[PDB]
Amino acid sequence: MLVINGTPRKHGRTRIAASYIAALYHTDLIDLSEFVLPVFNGEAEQSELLKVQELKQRVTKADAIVLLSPEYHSGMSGALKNALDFLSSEQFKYKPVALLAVAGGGKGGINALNNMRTVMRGVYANVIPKQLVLLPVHIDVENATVAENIKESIKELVEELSMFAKA
Amino acid sequence: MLVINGTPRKHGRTRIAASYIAALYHTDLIDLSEFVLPVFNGEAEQSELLKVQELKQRVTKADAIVLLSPEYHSGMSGALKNALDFLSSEQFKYKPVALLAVAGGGKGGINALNNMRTVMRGVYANVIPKQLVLLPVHIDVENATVAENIKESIKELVEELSMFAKA
Ligand SMILES: Cc1cc2nc3c(=O)[nH]c(=O)nc-3n(C[C@H](O)[C@H](O)[C@H](O)COP(=O)(O)O)c2cc1C
Ligand SMILES: Cc1cc2nc3c(=O)[nH]c(=O)nc-3n(C[C@H](O)[C@H](O)[C@H](O)COP(=O)(O)O)c2cc1C
């Protein structure tokens, strides 16, 4: 299983949630706050950058992917969308994918979730029904972890994902 | 009026569409294929960057914005979304905005437009009802211009935008 943190901010909540999942379920982790890619430009030179080549290899190799992203302006991060722009159905086709969005509060998160789902379908990925929105109340920044109130939801998310990866 | 080209590819169709509009209507132009920003990372140092400050001022002073983007995996480009992530409602609130998507295939464009409208709403922009989709048939790459069949469509889009800007 592969977990991708979609927040470019080293101090972002989404990064906390991503780390929690990867550690707990012994999964692979791509952290976009550390995995700095250039802005896609369609030039062939970019397809020979180690990081881009690595992104393709690890996504193709994952039997299942948990896609995390903060909600920036009612959409997924440009950081994550930029990363996906390097990729195609070549890596995502029939790929079991689970969606999680981290919002600033209220009714945020849905737009980002749908954005990710739409884009995942654009590359012919299999996005499981269960999707999750995390709010600031679900994140513990000082202790660098998620709150107890959301741990059950995340487990349900991962379990549905890995179960669908087998099926 | 400000025209923003959302395609990072110097050889992109969207860039040709954006240049046609900017030249014809004597508008300000931001071209993401030449206007390369860093991947947003939420760090204060980035706000000092000249291009970031320029991006904010130019969008702020614009009486109206023509937002173009290619459909990348059923969404706006990562380059465009990344640029928008540097911005907020402070620059976009009540800003008259027209949406134009450039798809590569028959029934493409709708998903990008949804994504764009949703995002523009997220920053409280005033998106006009009329939106437009350009196909490869509407772009003459060889002559670096748009086909005659679409010139009237583009014209009417700009005109509705000006009208909103005046209101
Ligand atoms: C550029 C930017 C745009 C944001 N837009 C939204 C938004 O549209 N809706 C929302 O609920 N929160 C928004 N937020 C707040 C984020 O949800 C908040 O930072 C949250 O912790 C997830 O982002 P993070 O992983 O970077 O921490 C935005 C934050 C930034 C930096
Ligand atoms: C990364 C990437 C993803 C694309 N995905 C789509 C797609 O989702 N739907 C579509 O109609 N065209 C898609 N295309 C084709 C573009 O629409 C085509 O390149 C078009 O000319 C607009 O992009 P451009 O401005 O870079 O030329 C994609 C192109 C790229 C580079």
Curated annotation (Swiss-Prot), chains A, B:
Enzyme class (EC, first level): oxidoreductase
Any one of the GO CC terms: cytosol
Q: Which Pfam families match?
A: FMN_red
Listed under subunit, the entry gives: Homotetramer.
* Cofactors that this protein relies on: FMN
What this protein is reported to do is described as: Catalyzes the reductive cleavage of azo bond in aromatic azo compounds to the corresponding amines. Requires NADPH, but not NADH, as an electron donor for its activity.
Q: What is this protein's record name?
A: FMN-dependent NADPH-azoreductase
Keyword Coiled coil annotated: no
What positions does the entry give for FMN binding?
A: 7-9, 13-14, 71-74, 104
